[PDB]
């Protein structure tokens, strides 16, 4: 990106970059770390147990959390987790906290409680260039 300030800013220092884009003032003044991401993801893994075992929602949340924790485990520096998960760690901790917050509302609504012969029609679109252009 281009910085509109006429002064020279380093931006290799990651704390300066987090200050300049307003992460400190507007999202989280406390710096997010790898341990806080691990704690938040384990909070999600504890919170999802209110969903039934056979539900696809629980499997989806658990698989996402397990992949995130494996990324956290195999990478020690927080810049590596930033480069893998394509965000700032403050964003990722907020994502995990929001995912943990979501669980009681979904569990109260119970979307998994459909009949056994539940049916959803789907209509898909095929482009003309599939049959007109070269295979």
């Amino acid at each position: 990106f281009k910085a509109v300030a006429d002064v020279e800013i380093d931006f290799n220092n990651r704390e300066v970059l987090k200050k300049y884009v307003g992460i400190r003032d507007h999202l989280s003044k406390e710096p997010g770390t790898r341990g806080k991401l691990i704690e938040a993801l384990t909070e999600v893994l504890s919170s999802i147990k209110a969903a039934p075992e056979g539900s696809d929602y629980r499997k989806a949340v658990e698989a996402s959390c397990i992949y995130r924790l494996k990324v956290c485990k195999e990478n020690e520096s927080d810049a590596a987790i930033e480069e893998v998960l394509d965000a700032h760690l403050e964003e990722l901790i907020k994502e995990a906290k929001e995912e943990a917050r979501l669980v009681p509302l979904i569990a109260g609504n119970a979307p998994w409680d459909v009949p056994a012969d539940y049916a959803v029609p789907v209509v898909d679109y095929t482009d003309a260039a599939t049959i007109l252009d070269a295979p």
């Binding site: 893998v84 539940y118 679109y125 095929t126 260039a129 007109l132």
Partner: protein, 90 residues
């Protein structure tokens, strides 16, 4: 410092009604002057909508979805931005 208000003949030297060179504008491709068949390029009327089989007892495996994701900074692959929209050769 470049000056606003250029002087005589330094800007719009010729009026658009007195263009100094005659213009030859292409209005057709040379590939279509003598090859005029239309049904081989009827993209408008050849798109399809198909009703899928009823999405009930399918098998969403999350293991395969999360098994294709990277875990290290290198081995992350990114989709490059498309340079142009499709022109179909024209």
């Amino acid at each position: 410092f470049e000056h606003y208000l250029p002087m005589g003949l330094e800007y719009r030297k010729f009026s658009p009604g007195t263009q100094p060179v005659k213009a030859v504008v292409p209005h057709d491709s040379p590939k279509l002057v003598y090859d005029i068949k239309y049904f081989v390029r009827d993209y408008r009327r050849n798109n399809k909508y198909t009703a899928r089989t009823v999405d009930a007892k399918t098998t969403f495996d999350f293991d395969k979805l999360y098994a294709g994701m990277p875990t290290k900074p290198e081995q992350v692959k990114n989709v490059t931005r498309p340079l142009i929209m499709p022109t179909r050769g024209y």
